[PDB]
């Protein structure tokens, strides 16, 4: 999920901003790149 | 009389104007000056680089110095051969810097954090650490591996 | 000499830029127009018609705003004055202290000229509620935090502190520390036992953060 | 100055004479001096502006070149050159 | 000559970093239980595997 600062959730904005960090981004970026990799192969089927 | 400085600083041993990157140009300077030549008008000092990290600690300090020392270690060791990997380098520079001052690995600098007298008298020392710990009546603990 | 003098008025003007943007990130209230001016407006304001600049008239005053007085419950406006001659002594530092006396606030800050001597060091850290700060004109030209390697250093209140210790369940101190009188430390004016969150970027997983306290 | 006195042939050193006079003599032997002492050891681009250089000249034509100097916010410094004399000139 | 010099470098480098480990809190800590770093390499992945 998301944790903003100390003991508080953020809402629908700072997700892109990400000034709050809290790390764990190594786990997020892995799922991201893995998803877009399948997308790149999927959009390749489109042009084909 | 034909000695004393008319202009410039009392630092630089010599300088060079070299071709930077593909077609560009820039200069490299040999000296301890740093900030003063960065403060020197006519050049943008935003993006620069300097060796001998210890002195970089005297200007930028701490973090920026730790980022510089892991930058040089990786560089020179990525040329001659093989790979040391990015992981093992970052931990080496972190354990040195984390105290807030760059020091270590030398008998004069090896005593910073560790309060254990036996392991310090193990690596390098003989007489002093045994009598010094008796004088000040140290206690500490037996914790570490060695 | 017209040449070397215009070098110094550009220096001080850029030095005025440094001390300006510095007071902004502390939470104090200014605007983007305050820190940003060309050479034109600078020559009119603080420089006479004779062509020689001034010193004491550069002094100004600024306060905090909104969250700055919310996050940190104890704080307020300050009073900044400049120096006169490179030689430092009792002199105008007396009335400077006096200026702090009746006008209260928190920390009077003053920029040096050239040399510092133990005379002016007679009393640096005075008064019971607060203290002051010392800065050199030489050392201040461009900001260090904005330079190259130095990343964003985020100061936090006592709230976030105790919560951070409730995360990993840790005793106080014992964290990676940060020395004081350090050019970065004194820049933001950190006191004893103040945790500053540091966001650094190097390439492995890319962006990640770590916490460093201040001794 | 590395001089020498005849006869003995050792050296000559400056000695302060009484009441305003400066002299020199060889050490531990009679002699007198000085005479006067001396030693010695060892273009396409063009613009229109008024030329400050004046003999009879008062030249109209001039040269210029453009580059950014000092701070980024710091204005442009221009260099001027004259056709006739070929004098370099610098002002911001 | 290089053979004799090989032993000095690595050794003295060891005695500093000799005692270090990784707890179940994922934070790498020392023998004094001080935390030098919150996460290893900013990732936590081992280069061995
Ligand atoms: Zn003679």
Curated annotation (Swiss-Prot), chain B:
- Where is this gene product found? Nucleus
Its encoding gene is what? Answer: RPO31
**What species was this sequence derived from?**
Saccharomyces cerevisiae (strain ATCC 204508 / S288c)
Task: State any further remark.
Answer: Present with 6020 molecules/cell in log phase SD medium.
| Subunit and partners | Component of the RNA polymerase III (Pol III) complex consisting of 17 subunits.
Name of the protein in question: DNA-directed RNA polymerase III subunit RPC1
Transmembrane stretches in the record are none
Q: Which domain of life is it from?
A: Eukaryota
> Any idea what job this protein has?
DNA-dependent RNA polymerase catalyzes the transcription of DNA into RNA using the four ribonucleoside triphosphates as substrates. Largest and catalytic core component of RNA polymerase III which synthesizes small RNAs, such as 5S rRNA and tRNAs. Forms the polymerase active center together with the second largest subunit. A single-stranded DNA template strand of the promoter is positioned within the central active site cleft of Pol III.
Q: Record's family? A: Belongs to the RNA polymerase beta' chain family.
Curated annotation (Swiss-Prot), chain C:
Main subcellular localization, coarse class?
A: nucleus
Any one GO cellular component localisation term in the record: nucleus
- For whether the record's keyword set contains Lyase, the answer is no
The entry's localization annotation reads:
Nucleus
Q: Pfam families annotated for this entry?
A: RNA_pol_Rpb5_C, RNA_pol_Rpb5_N
Q: Which PROSITE patterns match?
A: RNA_POL_H_23KD (PS01110)
Q: Does the keyword DNA-binding apply?
A: yes
Query: Any idea which GO molecular function terms this record carries?
Result: DNA binding; DNA-directed RNA polymerase activity
Xref: InterPro entries: Arch_Rpo5/euc_Rpb5, RNA_pol_Rpb5_N, RNA_pol_Rpb5_N_sf, RNA_pol_subH/Rpb5_C, RNA_pol_subH/Rpb5_CS, RPB5-like_sf
Which GO terms of type biological process are on file? nucleolar large rRNA transcription by RNA polymerase I; ribosome biogenesis; RNA-templated transcription; termination of RNA polymerase I transcription; termination of RNA polymerase III transcription; transcription by RNA polymerase I; transcription by RNA polymerase II; transcription by RNA polymerase III
Which key words tag this protein in UniProt? Answer: DNA-binding, DNA-directed RNA polymerase, Nucleus, Ribosome biogenesis, Transcription
On assembly, the entry states: Component of the RNA polymerase I (Pol I), RNA polymerase II (Pol II) and RNA polymerase III (Pol III) complexes. Component of the RNA polymerase I (Pol I) complex consisting of 14 subunits: RPA135, RPA190, RPC40, RPA14, RPB5, RPO26, RPA43, RPB8, RPA12, RPB10, RPC19, RPC10, RPA49 and RPA34. The complex is composed of a horseshoe-shaped core containing ten subunits (RPA135, RPA190, RPB5, RPO26, RPB8, RPB10, RPC10, RPA12, RPC19 and RPC40) where RPA135 and RPA190 form the DNA-binding cleft.
Role this protein plays: DNA-dependent RNA polymerases catalyze the transcription of DNA into RNA using the four ribonucleoside triphosphates as substrates. Common component of RNA polymerases I, II and III which synthesize ribosomal RNA precursors, mRNA precursors and many functional non-coding RNAs, and small RNAs, such as 5S rRNA and tRNAs, respectively. Pol II is the central component of the basal RNA polymerase II transcription machinery. RNA polymerase complexes are composed of mobile elements that move relative to each other.
Gene behind this protein: RPB5
From Swiss-Prot, chain D:
Q: Which GO terms describe its molecular function?
A: DNA-directed RNA polymerase activity; nucleic acid binding; zinc ion binding
Location relative to the cell: Nucleus, Nucleolus
Q: Which domain of life is it from?
A: Eukaryota
Swiss-Prot/TrEMBL keywords: DNA-directed RNA polymerase, Metal-binding, Nucleus, Transcription, Zinc, Zinc-finger
Q: Which GO terms describe its biological process?
A: termination of RNA polymerase III transcription; transcription by RNA polymerase III; transcription initiation at RNA polymerase III promoter; tRNA transcription by RNA polymerase III
The entry's cellular-component GO terms read: nucleolus; nucleoplasm; nucleus; RNA polymerase III complex
Check the record and name the InterPro entries matching this protein.
DNA-dir_RNA_pol-M_15_CS (IPR019761), Rpa12/Rpb9/Rpc10/TFS (IPR012164), Zn_ribbon_RPB9 (IPR001529), Zn_ribbon_RPC11_C (IPR034014), Znf_TFIIS (IPR001222)
Q: Which amino acids does the record list as binding Zn(2+) 1?
A: 5, 8, 26, 29
The task this protein performs is described as: DNA-dependent RNA polymerase catalyzes the transcription of DNA into RNA using the four ribonucleoside triphosphates as substrates. Component of RNA polymerase III which synthesizes small RNAs, such as 5S rRNA and tRNAs. Involved in Pol III transcription reinitiation and RNA cleavage during transcription termination.
Protein name according to UniProt: DNA-directed RNA polymerase III subunit RPC10
What is the primary gene name for this protein? RPC11
């Amino acid at each position: 999920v998301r944790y903003d600062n100390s003991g508080c959730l953020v809402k629908r904005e700072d997700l892109n901003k990400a000034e709050y960090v809290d790390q764990y981004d190594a786990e997020r970026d892995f799922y991201h790149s893995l998803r877009e990799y399948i997308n790149g192969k999927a959009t390749a089927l489109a042009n084909l | 009389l034909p000695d004393v400085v008319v202009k410039g600083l009392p630092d630089i041993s010599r300088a060079v104007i070299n071709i930077r990157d593909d077609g560009k140009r820039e200069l490299l300077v040999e000296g301890y000056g740093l900030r003063d030549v960065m403060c020197t008008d006519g050049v943008i000092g935003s993006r620069t680089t300097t060796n001998h990290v210890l002195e970089v600690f005297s200007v930028l300090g701490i973090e920026a110095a730790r980022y510089s020392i892991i930058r040089e270690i990786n560089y020179t060791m990525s040329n001659h051969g093989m790979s040391v990997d990015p992981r093992h380098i970052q931990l080496l520079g972190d354990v040195m810097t984390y105290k807030g001052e760059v020091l270590g690995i030398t008998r004069f600098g090896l005593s910073k954090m560790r309060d254990s007298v036996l392991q310090l008298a193990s690596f390098e020392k003989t007489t002093d650490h045994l009598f010094d710990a008796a004088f000040y009546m140290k206690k500490d603990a037996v914790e570490g591996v060695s | 000499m017209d040449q070397e003098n215009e070098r110094n008025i550009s220096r001080l003007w850029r030095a005025f830029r440094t001390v300006k943007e510095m007071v902004k990130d502390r939470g104090y209230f200014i605007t983007q127009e305050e820190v940003e001016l060309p050479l034109e407006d600078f020559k009119a304001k603080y420089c006479d018609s004779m062509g020689r600049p001034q010193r004491k008239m550069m002094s100004f005053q600024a306060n905090p705003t909104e969250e700055s007085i919310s996050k940190f419950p104890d704080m307020g406006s300050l009073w900044v004055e400049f120096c006169d001659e490179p030689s430092v002594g009792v002199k105008t530092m007396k009335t400077f202290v006096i200026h702090i006396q009746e006008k209260n606030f928190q920390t009077g800050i003053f920029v040096y000229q050239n040399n510092i001597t133990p005379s002016a060091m007679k009393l640096v850290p005075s008064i019971p509620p607060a203290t002051i700060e010392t800065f050199n004109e030489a050392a201040l030209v461009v900001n260090i935090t904005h330079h190259e390697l130095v990343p964003k250093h985020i100061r936090l209140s006592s709230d976030e502190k105790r919560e951070l210790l409730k995360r990993y369940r840790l005793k106080e101190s014992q964290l990676p520390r940060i020395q004081r009188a350090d050019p970065v430390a004194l820049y933001l004016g950190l006191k004893r036992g103040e945790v500053v969150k540091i966001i650094r970027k190097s390439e492995t997983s890319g962006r990640y953060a770590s916490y460093r306290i201040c001794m | 100055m590395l001089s020498f006195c005849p006869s003995c042939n050792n050296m000559l050193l400056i000695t302060s004479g009484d009441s305003g006079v400066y002299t020199l003599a060889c050490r531990s032997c009679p002699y007198e001096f000085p005479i006067e002492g001396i030693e010695i050891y060892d273009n396409v681009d063009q613009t229109k502006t008024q030329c400050p250089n004046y003999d009879t000249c008062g030249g109209e034509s001039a040269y210029f070149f453009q580059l950014q100097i000092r701070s980024a916010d710091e204005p442009m410094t221009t260099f001027y050159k004259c056709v006739n004399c070929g004098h370099r000139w610098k002002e911001n | 000559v290089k053979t004799a010099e090989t032993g000095y470098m690595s050794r003295r480098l060891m005695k500093s970093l000799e005692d270090l480990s990784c707890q179940y809190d994922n934070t790498v800590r020392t023998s004094a239980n001080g935390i030098v770093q919150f996460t290893y390499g900013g990732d936590g992945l081992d280069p061995l595997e």
